[PDB]
Structure formats: structure tokens, C-alpha cells
Ligand binder design. Sequence first.
Ligand SMILES: N[C@@H](CCC(=O)N[C@@H](CS(=O)(=O)O)C(=O)NCC(=O)O)C(=O)O
Ligand SMILES: N[C@@H](CCC(=O)N[C@@H](CS(=O)(=O)O)C(=O)NCC(=O)O)C(=O)O
Lengths: 203, 203
Amino acid sequence: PNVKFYYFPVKALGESQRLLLAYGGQEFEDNRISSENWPEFKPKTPFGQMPVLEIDGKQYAQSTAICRYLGRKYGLAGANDEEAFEIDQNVEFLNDIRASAASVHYEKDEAVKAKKKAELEETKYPFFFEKLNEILTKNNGHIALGKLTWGDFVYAGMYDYLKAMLQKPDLEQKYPAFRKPIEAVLAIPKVKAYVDAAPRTEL
Amino acid sequence: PNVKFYYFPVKALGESQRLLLAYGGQEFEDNRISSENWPEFKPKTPFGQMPVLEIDGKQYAQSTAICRYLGRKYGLAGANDEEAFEIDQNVEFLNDIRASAASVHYEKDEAVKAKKKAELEETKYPFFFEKLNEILTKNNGHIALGKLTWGDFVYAGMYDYLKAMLQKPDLEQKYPAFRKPIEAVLAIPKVKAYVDAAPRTEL
Ligand SMILES: N[C@@H](CCC(=O)N[C@@H](CS(=O)(=O)O)C(=O)NCC(=O)O)C(=O)O
Ligand SMILES: N[C@@H](CCC(=O)N[C@@H](CS(=O)(=O)O)C(=O)NCC(=O)O)C(=O)O
């Protein structure tokens, strides 16, 4: 198929799709649209956002939905409904962590941001980190099924962005399991080759 | 199967699962756990939250993941990968609306809440409402595929909760399409029977 991927020049929510395309051996145009050029493309997208994946002229939007689609195409979505459910479930948990951290990161009033951060540090984050540690340990370094799944790609693509929003650059010092899905994805030669060749960003 | 559903005594994020079980003709224990009793059950759940669906003793958490699972079991997830993708995509869009509204609704500082609300009213909500109107019109009163899907159940279950968070009780006056997925779900006799028999709540 003729495949084009459109996202900002950052990893954040789109990198997981890039990593999955690499995994599946799919050649693609990796179109990294700057903030300055984005307004020209915005009204051409399904929801006025990126990422957008284009396959043979047809557009696919919504990062998690795209990852699940690619996951199924590439054999990373389990063998049956129950296995597929578990990946969905655990990725939805990751999304709760991300949404919580984003509520702090994108707060423009610094006094409000400080209050929110402190609240999450006492009432959500300790629970999230222990739960993530449980999941990664139960699954032998993976997000789900004890083995490589599309959930690991979601995790690996957003991990640096999530750490930035949490303001815990050193998270994996206390929780060494947290680097394991990233190592799993990078151990795949096609994926490592794409990462080596790809533009670097902090988030 | 022996099926039990655990959630708070509210519609909010859990009602879509109740509606789907009704659709599929699945008898279930609808266990509405109060805030007062919830701390006893919390550590028995997969992530310290509800909803939780139990099937033959096995627990399933994460509302959207559960809905998609039930959707597939009951023939409401499309006929192929492309159709399934579209439902996922459009439900992920609904989630963006919900997450945005929740950022206002759950703000405890009223001065901050007012600023956030005003910002969303000028910069996100007009776009969300036009996009939702497009989708519902394109799909003949549905969230996806031009026909009944599990996405309609997600929409119908949370609609009153979403309107409460948006502070637009009268939303469907400007946008009459917005009531159509709810009408579609309620036109199914098994679903209407469950709704008639079920406890009522404002959200
Ligand atoms: N639910 C969507 C959210 C996408 C989204 O928020 N995209 C952003 C930026 S990023 O946060 O993902 O980097 C966007 O297009 N922003 C630009 C705009 O809204 O004009 C998804 O998961 O794909
Ligand atoms: N991502 C989860 C979120 C669930 C969630 O936030 N549940 C809440 C309340 S509700 O907002 O959905 O009504 C909960 O259990 N809160 C209780 C607690 O955290 O102790 C899902 O979609 O199921």
C-alpha cells in the first residue's frame, strides 16, 4: 500500500504509529508537519488534529485507534477476543496516567499548576506507579499478555513525553521495570533501524 | 455465563456497558456500589476503579475496552478491520469531548473553572459541536458506519453526564441530531425494557 503518516515533529502521541509501521516492514512517508505549516493541513484532516495515517488515499485518525488497527494487521493484538481485550484494557490505564499528567503539564497558571501537581503527587501518582509496576512485572516487561503487543508500542512511543509531563525524568531509577517495554520494542531490528534513522526530539 | 457488573449508582461511564448487556440479552447482576461502600471493593478491582464487569469470575476493567469487547460479542463492531477502526476512531473523538468538559466540571477553584470554561467555549467546544453534528449527520443518526454500533451505546450512556459537564442542558435544541443515537438505542426493545426497569439518575 501507499502509506503516509502526518504528525508534528515530536514523538508524543504519534511515535507509536511510526514504530508499528516500522515493525510491520511498511515503507511510509514520515511527514513531520511543523506548527507553522500545520494550519494549511488542519482542515484536510478528519477531526482537525494529527496524527493522521493515510493508506491508499484513505485517512485514519485517532492515535489509539490507529495503533490498534496496525496491531491487528501485524499480529500484535492477541489471538482471540480475550487477549485483545487485555491489551485494550491496559492501554486505557496508560491513558489515565497520561491524561492526569497532562492536566498538570498544560496548566498555564503556575500557582494552579503547583496545586494540581501536589494533589496528584499525594492522591493519584503513587497508585499509578505501583499499578504500572505490577503490570510490567506480571507481564515480564510488557504492557499485556506477557509478550510483545501493540500496547508496548503505545508505551514506548510516549514514554519520554509522559516523563516530561510527570516531571520525573528519573522515574525508572525507582522503577527499573519501566524501561522494559522500550527495550522490547528496540530489540526488534526493523524498529531499531527506523529509530536510528529518525529525527530525534526531547518529547 | 454468570455476569455481574459493578459501578457507581450513576450512568456516567458505566451505563454504556449496562445498555450493551441488555442489547445482547445477557442477564446480569447490576451491582450499584455506593460511594460509602466502595472502599471495601476498591482493592478487589484491577485498577482501583469502576466499572468492572465480571464474567464467570473473571474481571474486565476499563469502560471503553469493555464496550468494545461486548460490541464484538454482540455483532456491533463492524464486519472487518476497517469498519471496526471507524467505530474506534469516532469513539476516541467522543472521548476528547468528554475529557475537555471534565477539565471544567471537576475544577474545584471557581475562578479557575470560569477561565477554563470561557477558553473552551471560544477554542474547542464550537469545533467539537460542529464535528459531532457532521458525524451524526453523515452516519444517519449514528456515531459510525451509518448504522447501530457499540459507539452509539457509548454515546447514549454518557450523554446526560456530558451535557452536565458542558453546562449545555439544551444542547440538542441547536443540534437536533444529537439525540439520534439515544433514540436508536432506545428503539431496541430489550434495551428499552432494561432502561424502564433501571434506577434513574441525573448523570
Ligand atoms: N484524540 C486524538 C488527540 C490528538 C491531539 O490532541 N493532537 C494534537 C497535538 S498532540 O498533542 O498530539 O501533539 C493536535 O493535533 N493539536 C493541534 C490542534 O488542535 O490544532 C488522538 O489521540 O489522536
Ligand atoms: N479509565 C477508566 C476510568 C474509570 C474511573 O475514573 N472511574 C471512577 C469514577 S467515574 O468517574 O467513572 O464515575 C472511579 O472508580 N472513581 C473512584 C476512585 O478512584 O476511587 C474507565 O474508563 O473505566
